[PDB]
Paper text:
The transient receptor potential channel subfamily A member 1 ([name]) ion channel is an evolutionary conserved polymodal sensor responding to noxious temperature or chemical stimuli. [name] is a member of the transient receptor potential (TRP) superfamily with a symbolic cytosolic domain formed by a particularly large number of ankyrin repeats (ARs). While the four isoforms exhibit similar responses to electrophilic agonists, they exhibit distinct thermosensitivities, and the [name]-A isoform is shown to be the most heat-sensitive to either absolute temperature or heating rate. As with hTRPA1, the transmembrane domain of each subunit consists of six transmembrane α-helices (S1–S6), with S1–S4 forming the voltage-sensor-like domain (VSLD) and S5–S6 forming the pore domain organised in a domain-swapped manner.
However, in state-1, the ARD is prominently stabilised in a four-leaf propeller-shaped structure, and the high local resolutions allow modelling of 17 ARs in total (AR0–AR16). For state-1, 1053 residues (88.0% of the total number of residues) were structurally built with 953 residues assigned. The N-terminus starts from residue number 58, with most of the ARs faithfully assigned. In state-1, IFH and the succeeding loop (named IFH-loop) insert into a pocket formed by the pre-S1 helix, S1, TRP helix and S4–S5 linker and are stabilised by hydrogen bonding and ionic and hydrophobic interactions with adjacent elements. Compared with the state-2 structure of [name]-A, these interactions and the insertion of the IFH-loop cause pre-S1 to rotate around the pivot at the joint of pre-S1 and S1 by 12˚. Strikingly, compared with that of state-2 structure, the coiled-coil domain has a large downward movement with ~12–13 Å. Besides the coiled-coil domain, two new interfaces are identified between neighbouring subunits in the ARD domain of the state-1 structure. One is between AR16 of one subunit and the nexus domain from the adjacent subunit (the loop between the first two β-strands), named interface-1, and the other is within the ARDs between two adjacent subunits (AR6–AR9 of one subunit and AR12–AR14 of the neighbouring subunit), named interface-2. Missing of the state-1 structure at the high temperature suggests that it might be a resting or pre-sensitised state prior to heat stimuli. The state-1 structure might represent an initial closed, or resting state of [name]-A isoform.
Residue numbers in the entry:
A (entry chain D): 514 to 696, 713 to 781, 819 to 1098
B (entry chain A): 942 to 1026
C (entry chain C): 856 to 941
Write the structure that this text describes.
Amino acid sequence: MTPLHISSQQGHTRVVQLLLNRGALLHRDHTGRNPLQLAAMSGYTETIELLHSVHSHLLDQVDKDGNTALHLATMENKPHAISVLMSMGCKLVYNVLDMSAIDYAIYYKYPEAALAMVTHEERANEVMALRSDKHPCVTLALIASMPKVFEAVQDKCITKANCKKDSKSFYIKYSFAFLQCPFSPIPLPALNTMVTHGRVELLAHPLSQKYLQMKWNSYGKYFHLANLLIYSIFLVFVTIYSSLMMNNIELKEERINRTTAILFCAVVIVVYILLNSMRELIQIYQQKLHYILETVNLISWVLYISALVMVTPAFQPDGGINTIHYSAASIAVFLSWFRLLLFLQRFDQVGIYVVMFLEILQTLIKVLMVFSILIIAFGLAFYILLSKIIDPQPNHLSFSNIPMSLLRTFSMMLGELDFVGTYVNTYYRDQLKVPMTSFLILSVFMILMPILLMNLLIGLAVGDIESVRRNAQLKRLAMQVVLHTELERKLPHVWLQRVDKMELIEYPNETKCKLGFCDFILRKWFSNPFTE
Amino acid sequence: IAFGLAFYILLSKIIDPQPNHLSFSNIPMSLLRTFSMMLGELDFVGTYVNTYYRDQLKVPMTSFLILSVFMILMPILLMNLLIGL
Amino acid sequence: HYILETVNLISWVLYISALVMVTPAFQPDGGINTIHYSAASIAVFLSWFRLLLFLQRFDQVGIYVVMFLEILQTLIKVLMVFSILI
């Protein structure tokens, strides 16, 4: 370092003014830095503006590592010396590690030095179009790392006008240019990342709401209603067909009489399954590895096979009914209605109660596999003690088998111990095989299975209802994102990208059109974005 | 309605209707009886075990399947939703 | 600590009961009676209740056995005080 490097590093402005007027020449130090790199490493924005006015060429030359003056002021978090180096016209070039200026501010996690770059007035949308190697999109990297910064980028996408807030020419402009980032066009890129990391403050912001209300009014309100009314034809023609089969079930082998009402219902079922399987086979062609992962598709294959096995005796020459047709009927009627609860998650007033039901069902599968130990622990222990009763009365027959003693143990943590019938009556007439231990395993049963385990499952289903009423706003907004995602995953691209807009101009003083009665019904019982 | 129809399919055509299977011989009666056995009285020994070891239960291995998924979610999972609310 | 620690005292009721269970496989004739059904059921029940003490240390499902063995410590202090009412 020369004394021009040392004086400008410490920011002594009157000394660097003195050395310039007496002809202090300029050259690099051993690192490669000029006097303006060093004054920018420290935060002295009075010495940057002096040196740039005298020697204007040394703003945008690099050291031996390829860093400019903007990288160096970003590597150690001087946000006042970034807003000055960008206003003078720094060049925004890449490092020798191929890592830009905004990269070091989202990699060292400096939220102050990355807010001074993406909120700059002149040069905002030249640092949000860099597309580096470690970060391919700056929008999708601020939502992951620093979500307070991206809330201050959405504030600058809402521009007003200056017309006194109540005149007839006051428009408010929304700009969706950053929520749709071209780098496989996944449908809502910047909102599937808000819900993956769970950012509720970036979904409830008034730019994201108008981005969904642009899509709700466009296409996404008619194609949820037209998915429920197609399923409610398969729902009705299954419960009608199983109800008719139970009356028309006469003898002679057992054989049904194929009337013109169970033959009409068996055709509407078998034609619904083919047309709703050739929608499945299209979705198999692109989306192979989520059929292990997603459950609601796997439910629809047990439903569709069972409804095909149900309708087979309406097509044979004689109606061949047997045990395997009652089995497939009851699985088809039960799964047709349990599928209907998956469509009622998205209603308005009553939708939250199926979110609470399917979250305390996810916990009770992890609990009822861990504490399937205790059912095997007792169910074997009652099979040892209670199976060799010398006269099996039809209350001890439920323990004469190893799988039957595991059902019976599970259906007496629900209340019916039958204490008088199979422990007291069979003891005072000298029939209980091992007396003083049968009252020991039972006395430790009713301490911990119907008291201690059933109060564990109540205490877990109060903490999974409170943690839905807590974050209910995230649960509602994540339904509408995942709705519009898969809806335009299926629509054709030719009249998809011509109906969205890049910017919405709104006039909040003109006489609005009154709401149509068809549109008024669609807003009462659907989770719409119009409830702000 | 999902279970009450499903028990009407499996349990209505028992070849000797004992007065514990008469509550499932009708579609509105199988919707009362399903609602009054999420309150505790499954009657597991009376209408599933006694009528199985004397060869009277019509479809055996599925009647223990709908019942085993009944007592997971109606008298455990639904009745602990109404306590947590 | 054998007075103080419980999981060692469980392992001695388990090991004695499994020895009494296997005695009629070693006698000249198999002498089975009531005391061999008693030791069999305590050995099968305590073999699996010991298995819940190893699942405390798993990742996703381990917290649910911590909750089970903490509401079991309270329900012993309560079901000795309110053994008066019984």
